[PDB]
Amino acid sequence: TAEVMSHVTAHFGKTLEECREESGLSVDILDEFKHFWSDDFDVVHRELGCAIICMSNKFSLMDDDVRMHHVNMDEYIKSFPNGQVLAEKMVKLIHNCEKQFDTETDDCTRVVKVAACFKEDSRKEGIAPEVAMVEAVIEKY
Ligand SMILES: [Mg+2]
Ligand SMILES: [Mg+2]
Ligand SMILES: [Mg+2]
């Protein structure tokens, strides 16, 4: 659901600043991770793919194939209030997106394409949070 997605995003997004330098992710491309969810933000830069790899590896959310670690993701989403309602759905969505971009050779590009797909499908499924909702939870934890 949208509130669980907001907590996941608020928390995961804390690692964006430490990942900017090594990814090339200028604040002019993405200032706050919460904006990932705005209708007015296109999820397309290779640099954001590179940032997402960086951020994910902080929390061991990707495996050695630079794909989602399913068990670690499920455990992560379960760590938030009401997380069990999103965990299986979110892993499914991410994995179903991964399979669409398995032929992309560039890991950074592959992950940003997976990310745009996940945002799309999340909007479609009605679990995509508003930027306001992510912001409302930024203080936690
Ligand atoms: Mg770099
Ligand atoms: Mg470029
Ligand atoms: Mg690792």
Swiss-Prot record:
Superkingdom assignment: Eukaryota
Question: Which CDD domains does UniProt cross-reference here?
Answer: PBP_GOBP
List keywords of the entry alphabetically: Disulfide bond, Olfaction, Sensory transduction, Signal, Transport
Listed under GO biological process in this entry are: sensory perception of smell
Cystine bridges: 19-54, 50-108, 97-117
Q: Name one GO molecular function term.
A: odorant binding
Tissues expressed in: Detected in antenna (at protein level). Expressed at high levels in antenna.
InterPro entries hit by this protein: Odorant/phero-bd_Lep (IPR006072), PBP/GOBP (IPR006170), PBP_GOBP_sf (IPR036728)
Q: What does the UniProt function comment say about this protein?
A: Present in the aqueous fluid surrounding olfactory sensory dendrites and are thought to aid in the capture and transport of hydrophobic odorants into and through this fluid.
Give the family, as the similarity comment puts it. Answer: Belongs to the PBP/GOBP family.
Describe the protein's quaternary organization and the partners it interacts with: Homodimer.
- Write the protein's name: General odorant-binding protein 2
Taxonomic source organism: Bombyx mori
